[PDB]
Amino acid sequence: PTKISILGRESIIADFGLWRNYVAKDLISDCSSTTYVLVTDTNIGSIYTPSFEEAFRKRAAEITPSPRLLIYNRPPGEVSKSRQTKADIEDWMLSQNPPCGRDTVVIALGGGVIGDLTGFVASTYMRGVRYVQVPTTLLAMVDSSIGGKTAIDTPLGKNLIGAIWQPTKIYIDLEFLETLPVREFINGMAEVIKTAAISSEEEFTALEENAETILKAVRREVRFEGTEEILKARILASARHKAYVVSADEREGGLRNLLNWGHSIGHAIEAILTPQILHGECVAIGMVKEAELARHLGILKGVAVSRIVKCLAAYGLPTSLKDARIRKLTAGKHCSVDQLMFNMALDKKNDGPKKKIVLLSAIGTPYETRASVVANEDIRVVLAP
Amino acid sequence: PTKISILGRESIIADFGLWRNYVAKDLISDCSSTTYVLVTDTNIGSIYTPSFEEAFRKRAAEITPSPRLLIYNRPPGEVSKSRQTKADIEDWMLSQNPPCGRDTVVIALGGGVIGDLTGFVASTYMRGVRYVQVPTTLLAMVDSSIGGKTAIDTPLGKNLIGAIWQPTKIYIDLEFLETLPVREFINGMAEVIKTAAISSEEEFTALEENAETILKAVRRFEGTEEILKARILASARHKAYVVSADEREGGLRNLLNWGHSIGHAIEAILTPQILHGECVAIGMVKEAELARHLGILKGVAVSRIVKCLAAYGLPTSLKDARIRKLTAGKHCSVDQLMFNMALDKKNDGPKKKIVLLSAIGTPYETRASVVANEDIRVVLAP
Numbered sequence: 230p231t232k233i234s235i236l237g238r239e240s241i242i243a244d245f246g247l248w249r250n251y252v253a254k255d256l257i258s259d260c261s262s263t264t265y266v267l268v269t270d271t272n273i274g275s276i277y278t279p280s281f282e283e284a285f286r287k288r289a290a291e292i293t294p295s296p297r298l299l300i301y302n303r304p305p306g307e308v309s310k311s312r313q314t315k316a317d318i319e320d321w322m323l324s325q326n327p328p329c330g331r332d333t334v335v336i337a338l339g340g341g342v343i344g345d346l347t348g349f350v351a352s353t354y355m356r357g358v359r360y361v362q363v364p365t366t367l368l369a370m371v372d373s374s375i376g377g378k379t380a381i382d383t384p385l386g387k388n389l390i391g392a393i394w395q396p397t398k399i400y401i402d403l404e405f406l407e408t409l410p411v412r413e414f415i416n417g418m419a420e421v422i423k424t425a426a427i428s429s430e431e432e433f434t435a436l437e438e439n440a441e442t443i444l445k446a447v448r449r450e451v452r453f454e455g456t457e458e459i460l461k462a463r464i465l466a467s468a469r470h471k472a473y474v475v476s477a478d479e480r481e482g483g484l485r486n487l488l489n490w491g492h493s494i495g496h497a498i499e500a501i502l503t504p505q506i507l508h509g510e511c512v513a514i515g516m517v518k519e520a521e522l523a524r525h526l527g528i529l530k531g532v533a534v535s536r537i538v539k540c541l542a543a544y545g546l547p548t549s550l551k552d553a554r555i556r557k558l559t560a561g562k563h564c565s566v567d568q569l570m571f572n573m574a575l576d577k578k579n580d581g582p583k584k585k586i587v588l589l590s591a592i593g594t595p596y597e598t599r600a601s602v603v604a605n606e607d608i609r610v611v612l613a614p
Numbered sequence: 615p616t617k618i619s620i621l622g623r624e625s626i627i628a629d630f631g632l633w634r635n636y637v638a639k640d641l642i643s644d645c646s647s648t649t650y651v652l653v654t655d656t657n658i659g660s661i662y663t664p665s666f667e668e669a670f671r672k673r674a675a676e677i678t679p680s681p682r683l684l685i686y687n688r689p690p691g692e693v694s695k696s697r698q699t700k701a702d703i704e705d706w707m708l709s710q711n712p713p714c715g716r717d718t719v720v721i722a723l724g725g726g727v728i729g730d731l732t733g734f735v736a737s738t739y740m741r742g743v744r745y746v747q748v749p750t751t752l753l754a755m756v757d758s759s760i761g762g763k764t765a766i767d768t769p770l771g772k773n774l775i776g777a778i779w780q781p782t783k784i785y786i787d788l789e790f791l792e793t794l795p796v797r798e799f800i801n802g803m804a805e806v807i808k809t810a811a812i813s814s815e816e817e818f819t820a821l822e823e824n825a826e827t828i829l830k831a832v833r834r835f836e837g838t839e840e841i842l843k844a845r846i847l848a849s850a851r852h853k854a855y856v857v858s859a860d861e862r863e864g865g866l867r868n869l870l871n872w873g874h875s876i877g878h879a880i881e882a883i884l885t886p887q888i889l890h891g892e893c894v895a896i897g898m899v900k901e902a903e904l905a906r907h908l909g910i911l912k913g914v915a916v917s918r919i920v921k922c923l924a925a926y927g928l929p930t931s932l933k934d935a936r937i938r939k940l941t942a943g944k945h946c947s948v949d950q951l952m953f954n955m956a957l958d959k960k961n962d963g964p965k966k967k968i969v970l971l972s973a974i975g976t977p978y979e980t981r982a983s984v985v986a987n988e989d990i991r992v993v994l995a996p
């Protein structure tokens with residue numbers, strides 16, 4: 230049972246089995262309310278909901294009158310982070326009998342999609358209600374579920390409408406990783422590596438050295454036996470550094486830019502290759518190009534760059550828009566430089582039309598304590614595959 | 615030039631003419647940015663935008679590269695506080711070339727509708743951008759534009775989705791009142807009276823006295839300017855106070871909702887023919903009658919509440935001939951009213967909360983109070 234603090238509070242609980250025997254109980258005592266709304270997708274729900282309903286009803290029995298638990302199953306996939314889905318969950322909540330009010334405690338059970346969506350619904354529901362995060366994916370456990378950033382996508386782009394709404398509790402249950410598909414697991418490692426690359430060379434070395442052991446466990450269909458503590462240590466280091474940065478610059482006045490390393494170009498790449506290609510994968514290619522950019526600017530050494538590539542490759546992450554696997558999945562989708570530039574214009578870190586990108590000067594230490602303005606011409610160079 | 619502080623910042627500026635010769639200049643210096651988005655409705659825009667464009671372009675000529683001013687005209691009326699209009703403005707802001715980014719400074723020019731809408735758009739645009747309020751209606755100047763509450767409506771109700779996003783600046787230009795329709799002016803008085811009724815008997819008395827002078831001018835505020843302004847400011851000052859003490863409404867901010875528990879219920883039915891302040895007027899009477907039925911408020915204060923509302927030309931009953939005509943085909947049954955109050959945002963679970971006054975100028979508690987649904991049924995018919 231490990232606890233991390235963020236923005237002055239110990240909202241993060243990390244352990245194995247939290248879902249089966251801790252969440253329900255904790256919600257009733259620390260998140261007192263008459264109404265609990267659980268949001269997930271048809272896949273995750275069918276596998277983890279039954280267990281929870283009984284754990285909830287068993288903890289609610291003591292309370293009199295017993296609070297209610299309402300479950301909403303959204304379609305799986307990126308398609309659900311939409312205005313439509315936000316509105317559907319909202320109407321559903323309001324039309325309940327009785328309607329869900331401001332005491333409502335929302336529960337986000339799923340990955341970044343469910344998390345981003347659910348968190349956003351909570352921030353604006355009657356101008357804001359409490360919510361908790363229950364990340365079921367590695368990426369969610371090491372990144373998305375922490376920090377309060379929420380959002381949905383629009384036809385014009387990804388994460389353009391949203392809000393920073395901090396969850397009251399963050400339940401990181403490593404047991405969810407037991408059933409997480411190999412690809413998804415690899416996807417999340419992209420964020421783990423990113424987090425280390427901007428904080429400490431020691432942690433990054435740990436990821437390089439742990440690669441094989443981690444991967445073998447992920448590739449063995451049996452699950453993290455003699456590597457548990459190693460897995461928890463890598464996850465926690467990631468979660469701890471984010472909590473640190475978010476605590477110092479919650480609404481991104483500067484420092485929080487760093488968490489976006491590899492995302493300036495990554496998001497551009499993603500807006501094109503999605504949904505066939507995943508977020509972490511895009512961010513992987515993104516870290517390589519942004520690392521190559523820091524090189525083209527005499528900020529980052531050529532050695533660190535190659536090392537960045539070696540680590541991403543070691544965990545099975547693409548490091549080029551030319552990756553054989555990426556092409557087969559996208560049916561050939563081409564990422565034209567002009568398209569990648571147009572998409573980057575919508576990057577949220579931009580100061581006016583000045584494109585800002587996180588630049589590393591060395592593994593473990595950023596160039597500045599924020600993104601850096603970069604001429605559009607210097608960006609064009611690393612965008613050509 | 616009066617300045618009021620709220621939440622530790624001197625964001626509120628109050629004066630006559632701010633629009634014509636202060637906003638533009640102030641935005642450029644204190645709200646530095648490359649992009650300015652102005653939102654209004656087709657009516658207000660056509661009358662006040664031309665003036666501003668030139669004042670802006672005249673203040674921008676210095677800065678280089680030149681900062682831009684983008685104008686978006688939304689349809690007038692409550693119909694615009696919708697998910698659709700929120701989406702449209704956002705897509706329009708994201709579609710600009712270059713796209714409006716996180717440095718964007720949004721300008722809400724209009725009443726509560728534009729204000730609530732625009733403020734809400736700013737709060738979630740790329741997770742939040744700055745915005746300023748330029749209230750053109752009395753109600754907006756004395757209430758809506760202050761405090762950060764924003765929202766849009768849904769088919770199921772009013773102000774159900776929204777956010778508390780504080781504006782960087784609040785420009786109260788009394789000159790806008792020069793062209794404000796009599797009805798609209800009366801509408802806003804409903805909030806002025808409410809604010810006094812929950813803060814000071816002294817202020818409420820002054821409102822009782824200025825009743826005729828104010829009305830004669832409304833039915834252009836020459837030898838009464840300082841009277842009007844003093845009334846406006848007292849209202850704005852008390853709200854800033856309450857919002858400072860309880861921003862996200864964890865208690866004391868409930869009081870600003872006096873008359874709104876039943877008021878909003880009434881409104882959800884009679885809207886859009888009947889206005890917000892008017893509904894809140896009837897609402898204040900019933901909630902005052904409720905405090906009486908509970909032995910909290912004296913029968914004298916209630917009647918006095920009625921006299922003041924009537925004096926300013928505000929309805930004090932669902933029967934009121936004026937409301938009747940205006941809404942020929944609409945009734946307010948105890949049932950529909952009750953179903954509507956279920957959606958009140960102050961309700962602690964199924965417990966319906968309502969602000970109770972024990973006397974003009976002093977609330978029963980420092981928050982709304984739970985009230986049995988049966989005690990609410992009584993005053994919901996009159």
Ligand SMILES: O=C(O)[C@]1(O)C[C@H](CP(=O)(O)O)[C@@H](O)[C@H](O)C1
Nearest residue numbers: 372376378388420485488489492
């Ligand atoms: O500040 C954050 O928490 C992030 O930068 C937030 C981004 C999403 P954003 O670029 O839409 O802010 C996420 O992809 C990244 O992994 C971490």
Ligand SMILES: O=C(O)[C@]1(O)C[C@H](CP(=O)(O)O)[C@@H](O)[C@H](O)C1
Nearest residue numbers: 757761763773805867870871874
């Ligand atoms: O807190 C506020 O500013 C208000 O209570 C907010 C309400 C709107 P709400 O009931 O939708 O919050 C407004 O009508 C009232 O006059 C003042």
Ligand SMILES: [Cl-]
Nearest residue numbers: 315353390738
């Ligand atoms: Cl929204």
Ligand SMILES: [Zn+2]
Nearest residue numbers: 420492508512
């Ligand atoms: Zn990411």
Ligand SMILES: [Zn+2]
Nearest residue numbers: 805874890894
């Ligand atoms: Zn009101």
